[PDB]
Symmetry: C3
Subunit: 532 residues, 3 copies
């Protein structure tokens, strides 16, 4: 029939139907819907403003650009995380505040299906929404899937520490996309009364941040963090952020007389000029030559006084905030291959010794945040075993993963629980067939592996076994049920214990079964070690 045409507040939107195998009702897809005014010129380094309305019918049938980022790194991550057959090459632009919608609802009628907003990851430096296709999830579980984008790197996170540039522009874009949904999603057969935000990695941490922010209050009703939370140090800048702002400005060829002078100067810079600055800063690579405490991994989240009134530690410590069902999960080997490879980690010999371990762990300061006085003990706790240099390197990775995702995730889960809100945890342990060739088959539950089950990659790509297909059908149902009742459980699916005092979590993989006290031991150790 005639392409799908939905009416929104700003104007009519045109899309295209896409039927999936085994589903009569085709899925309506809208690509590149603007949810905010293009942040160009004077709007750079400022909160997102509403999108100007249009006079006729807007054709939303073309993938939007991805926010300015390292094009090589961007395309690489996309190819590794995409759930669709062939990766979709994208263009770069500052005009990237768009979102993609996938509704399996029959627009001719009135439907109120649950809405699931996806926040992509990429360390807040790279990524896009187009990378994730929701055609499968939307059909198999009959939910309206929405993928959003937000300013990355300098454009979405540059902060001078004061009012001239508070920061968190990227986080504000997410909040704006959430309001867009509350105001228009009903036009796509989605129930604005039931919105679930979920994201992986930096997207995960973003979810945690939104769950603690007063600005997002009432913009969602359930949240899910996949391998990433607000306690994930590397993504949250604590202390005086001024030194960073100046370092960036100097590189860009700007004076540092005052804050307003820097912001003004940086606004004058071109996109290419700021992309070059980015490349020079080398944000997603382990800095070897230099002091570990001087390596700037990124311009993560900050305490601007708007989105976040104080550090995540401080905020969660209190129990006076709108609580919602929150699902926090991690993978078996978060630091298995993906992250180390991208960051170009030194580990290439396949083995390591205490001395070298403590040497590498040190330079990993901008990631784990371990005082040089805690290096020995930390290394001993994980490598103080077998003489096998090879088995050491493996325990070294588990060492890093526990500090970045493991312990943090569990902590957030505990606090949310104590806050008196429905909490859930899981430990994904599986090795997708879509993995990379360079990835050693001895790795399972790597960073981002759960993505393929979540977005039903086995229903779009080819070569998926019946075992890999069912696993996905299970995850999608678990997720979708949560978006529906704030409870993953359902008929035909194993039992998922709510993370309470017993601290029971679900283990997903070849064999999905419940368990208890995830990393419980690991947490204890670090909680004391970190206490100096």
């Amino acid at each position: 029939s005639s392409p799908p045409v939905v009416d929104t507040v700003h104007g009519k939107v045109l899309g295209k139907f896409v039927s999936l195998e085994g589903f009569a009702q085709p899925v309506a897809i809208f690509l590149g819907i603007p949810f905010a005014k293009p942040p160009l010129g004077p709007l750079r380094f400022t909160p997102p403003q509403p999108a100007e309305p249009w006079s006729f019918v807007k054709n939303a049938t073309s993938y939007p650009p991805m926010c300015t980022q390292d094009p090589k790194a961007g395309q690489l991550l996309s190819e590794l995380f995409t759930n669709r057959k062939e990766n979709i090459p994208l263009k770069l632009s500052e005009d990237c505040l768009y979102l993609n919608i996938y509704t399996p609802a029959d627009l001719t009628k009135k439907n109120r299906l649950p809405v699931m907003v996806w926040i992509h990851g990429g360390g807040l430096m790279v990524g896009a929404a187009s990378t994730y296709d929701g055609l499968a999830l939307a059909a198999h579980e009959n939910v309206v899937v929405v993928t959003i984008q937000y300013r990355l790197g300098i454009w979405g996170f540059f902060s001078t520490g004061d009012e001239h540039s508070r920061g968190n522009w990227g986080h504000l874009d997410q909040v704006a996309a959430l309001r867009w949904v509350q105001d228009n999603i009903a036009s796509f057969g989605g129930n604005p009364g039931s919105v679930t935000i979920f994201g992986e990695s930096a997207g995960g941490e973003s979810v945690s941040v939104l769950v603690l922010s007063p600005l997002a209050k009432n913009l969602f009703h359930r949240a899910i963090s996949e391998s990433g939370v607000a306690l994930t140090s590397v993504l949250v800048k604590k202390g005086d952020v001024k030194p960073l702002a100046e370092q960036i400005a100097i590189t860009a060829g700007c004076k540092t007389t005052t804050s307003a002078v820097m912001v003004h100067c940086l606004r004058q810079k071109t996109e290419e000029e700021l992309l070059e600055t980015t490349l020079k800063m080398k944000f997603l690579s382990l800095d070897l030559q230099g002091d570990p405490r001087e390596s700037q991994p990124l311009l993560g989240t900050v305490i601007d006084g708007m989105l976040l009134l104080k550090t995540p530690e401080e905020l969660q410590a209190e129990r006076n905030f709108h609580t919602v069902p929150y699902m926090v999960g991690i993978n078996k080997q978060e630091f298995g291959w993906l992250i180390p490879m991208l960051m170009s980690y030194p580990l290439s010999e396949g083995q390591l010794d205490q001395k070298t371990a403590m040497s590498l762990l040190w330079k990993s300061y901008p990631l784990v945040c371990i005082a040089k006085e805690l290096i020995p003990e930390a290394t001993e706790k994980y490598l103080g075993g077998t003489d096998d240099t090879v088995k050491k390197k493996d325990l070294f990775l588990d060492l890093i993963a526990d500090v970045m995702f493991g312990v943090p995730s569990v902590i957030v889960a505990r606090n949310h629980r104590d806050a008196g809100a429905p909490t859930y945890m899981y430990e994904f342990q599986y090795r997708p067939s879509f993995s990379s060739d360079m990835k050693p088959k001895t790795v399972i539950g790597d960073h981002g592996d759960e993505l393929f089950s979540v977005f039903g990659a086995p229903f779009l790509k080819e070569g998926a076994s019946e075992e890999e297909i069912r696993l996905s059908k299970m995850v999608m149902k678990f997720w979708a049920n949560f978006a529906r009742n704030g409870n993953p459980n359902g008929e035909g699916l194993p039992h998922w214990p709510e993370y309470n005092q017993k601290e029971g979590y679900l283990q997903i993989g070849a064999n999905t079964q419940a368990a208890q006290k995830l990393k419980d031991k690991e947490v204890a150790f670090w909680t004391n070690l970190f206490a100096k």
Copy 2:
């Protein structure tokens, strides 16, 4: 006496008194009155905004700049259409939103004289208001004459097809200046309740557009289109305008990743950079090599969705719309010398044959928009007459004139007529003594020839025979009478029948008398041909 000082909404304006040979009543003249804020910087490619108010008295005693255009092309047209003796040298600037006023009213007393607002032509690419002196008309028929300006070329008509740059900036200016008139004319002895708009060529097509625009309603009560209407295709863009925008962005050295990207980039360019882009484009000149269907004649009117909700063809269909007295006229030989000479036509030998005719007609695509399979029938219907190559060249010029003005003008008139509103038509056939020395004396009723009678050139220049002086007097009468009563008739003047079903019109010239069915046979042929 002392310089006239009128009080307007945004401040007091100072002018000067000028006396015309024989008239005791001195005419108050104001030059350079702003009717909007200068469309500089971010205000480029945006609607005109109200002008900021001034403190003391503003000297409105100097000619304003003409809108940025091809300085050479603009200077030529100014010297070929000016009715004043010596041609005034103008300056270029994006700061060109001014209007000139000519009032014979006695400012010392309340006066409600009819107001005639003039809209200059020039293919929407060149032109200016200072070119036309309103002294003679204002004094002879006692009416306030107002010449207005509007953004041209890229500045006034650049459109990306969407909300990022809808377009028709130039027409919105025409509207702004009209609202200004309704708000201030009374202070100049003019009656806002009786404003007549009239223009020639592009100024004519503009009147035709305002007559059809829901925004213009109530800003004028009488319309006059001299050689140019909404059906003159060359000036109206249909279909996706996105290609033209992208071609312009590229020529200016801008990326085309998205609409917003283009507009932002172009807004960062200097006036001169856009003027160089203009010259590079080579607009008003016939392209003889390439593809006629791709040739870009100019940047005209589009369907923004604010000024025009749909194409003129569809608009004139409806009856449910406000209607006013409309006078549509054309010249004997619209494609006689002027236009061809300006666009550099291959016509130099002074004759033409059937074979070279069909070829030329095709390259003339951007003007007559005639299919390539229709060329044979069209050429045979006009040139199949005699075997005289010279007559074939003249009958070929009649071909282009009919398609660009003849047929369009009549169709527009018949629609206004059947719409239930007073309509009037005429055909000017005379050769002013103010013609160029380069125009053959055999050309009678060439494009723009009426302008000399309309603006009483015979009373400002020299060499005008009494016969020509007489023609001018009659013309200004009819006009002013039409302005006064929406009817040209008045004792002392030949009778001008209303354009009703008998399709009676007036032939102006040495011998002025009525006739019937103007271009009747012509309209039939062209409507039937295009039907295929």
Copy 3:
């Protein structure tokens, strides 16, 4: 016990304590508090906009930058006027709208002490607030002292003479600071209901202008003009100013097609570019050859139609406005050494004859504004006496001093008196030990010599004698009493008569006592000569 933290409408401010010998209660100092939004980008050449509120605690413990100016000239004047022991070197920046506060109040309690707002001088081309340390005056007279800054030169006074750039930006900033004081001063223990503005030189003229401006109505309750008033021609521009605008524009490398075009262009220029333009104009210096009337001193105050509705002459002619106690004073030798030296006067021979003098006075047209036909007359009235060139040189200095400050000051005073408001006058006659070596010891009461006494330099620098100390205590007490009651009289002080019909004034110096009719003779004379 802990750094001073104060809450304001815009956010928290953090200062520092500084104790002054003789006072138990340490003074709370706040440096660099923003009272407006940085006048950058499109904000240049526009009214000051409110400052953006900050989220946490802002540290105002660092000296703010001074507005862009001649770095050399700026730093020189600061060392010559500074009352602190060591001159503080400052940075330049368009982001200069800050104010400094010195409060002797105990912020742990509720206090409401009189507020004295200082407006530094420097011909509206240079100067800073930081130059003046309020520590002494604040502690000694128990009053809150506020030092403000305002846009200088082109940035603060560029006028096209119309609505596209009225001018007086620098005066608007001063008014913007006064509003900030009324909204937040109570947080600093200040009494918003008792604000006294005072300034020296261009600061004196500013105060004088604020007294005639409707915009300053109810923003201060007492005024003090030290050596400068609104009748000091040199700082006030009369007549068409457009010619000056164009002159700057061309120098800066801009077009001059229209006013809007000129302002649009200058806004594009970088700080460094406008600064280089400043240095080129040679604003401070004096041209010895050419034509005196073709020179150009500066960009003083203009008649914008906002800040000032008409010339100070016309405005003071009316007794229709808010009348507040006004104190106007001058020094013994206004043109004794300081100004001449800074402009580089050819008086490097210490001698001057009746013929060489008539030449200088003419060349000094932009400073005295005297028709060349009058030069001979005036020159006689002063130098027509002794045949001693050495005395002629001195009498010549008295000539200029009387025309710039002497006569203007008394006239301004008398008019205020006749308006029926409290008036007072004084004449400082002392030679501060904190003078410059290169300064002749025969010069007593040079321009700005009262500043050392007013700001208590004897209590900040070293070597002051018991006499110089006593003088400073007396002056401060006099100023503080005036701020308190609008009357300088108090116990322990001589009697300062009001400026009624007897025209009594105070002779401040080593021997302070009252007198009558200040410059009465000179006032009568000049008024006559100028009557031509």
